[PDB]
Design a protein around this nucleic acid. Structure first.
Length: 208
RNA sequence: CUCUCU
RNA sequence: CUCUCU
């Protein structure tokens, strides 16, 4: 009789097979915002411009499971994303400053995101995609009237909005749909006014 | 000059 | 049509 495949037992891999995307319209940064709220990309391999495919490396297999749970089938920019638990474990990283520039993005020392093992404070603000938003790291350099233009730029129905007088880094906001709220996260998370002064974006725990 | 719930 | 194109 023929031989078997001993590598077929390869589960809990911490990588994701990320497939069926439109690489014409979704960047390593858009991926990084999404997968990095859910579970923290250490790397983003993209194969080439018409493979329609990527091979993501996340912090842990349970965090990869949660990212998959929110992103397998996701509606962004055109095509529905496809995902599975992969078969790999690491990516090689090409060179010191070549092709890692967009096709093997090193987030192992990210400029602005990280996670740890479960039970850390890092997990406290992960919420499922909802029409209601919770917004943070907001500088004195903007007001209510500016933040309306940010979320209106999405197209764009701002339902609701209350600034946080109690703790002035923050606001609560709401949109007319979940897809508006999702694309407002994809847009405005890390919209930079300065070196630490940028928008930070989650879905809400609670209502306005 | 760093993280996120009213 | 589902994975390392340096």
């Amino acid at each position: 009789g023929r031989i078997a495949i001993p590598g077929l037992a390869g589960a809990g891999n911490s990588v994701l097979l990320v497939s069926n995307l439109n690489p014409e319209r979704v960047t390593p940064q858009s991926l990084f915002i999404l997968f990095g709220v859910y579970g923290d990309v250490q790397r983003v391999k993209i194969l080439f411009n018409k493979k329609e495919n990527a091979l993501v490396q996340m912090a842990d297999g349970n965090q990869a499971q949660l990212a998959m749970s929110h992103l397998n089938g996701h509606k962004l920019h055109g095509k529905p994303i496809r995902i599975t638990l992969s078969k790999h474990q690491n990516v090689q990283l090409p060179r010191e400053g070549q092709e890692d520039q967009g096709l093997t993005k090193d987030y192992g020392n990210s400029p602005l995101h990280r996670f740890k093992k479960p039970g850390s404070k890092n997990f406290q603000n992960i919420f499922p995609p909802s029409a209601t938003l919770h917004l943070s790291n907001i500088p004195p350099s903007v007001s209510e009237e500016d933040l309306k233009v940010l979320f209106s730029s999405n197209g764009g129905v701002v339902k609701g909005f209350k600034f946080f007088q109690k703790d002035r880094k923050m606001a609560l906001i709401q949109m007319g749909s979940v897809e508006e709220a999702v694309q407002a996260l994809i847009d405005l998370h890390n919209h930079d006014l300065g070196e630490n002064h940028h928008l930070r974006v989650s879905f809400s725990k609670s209502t306005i």
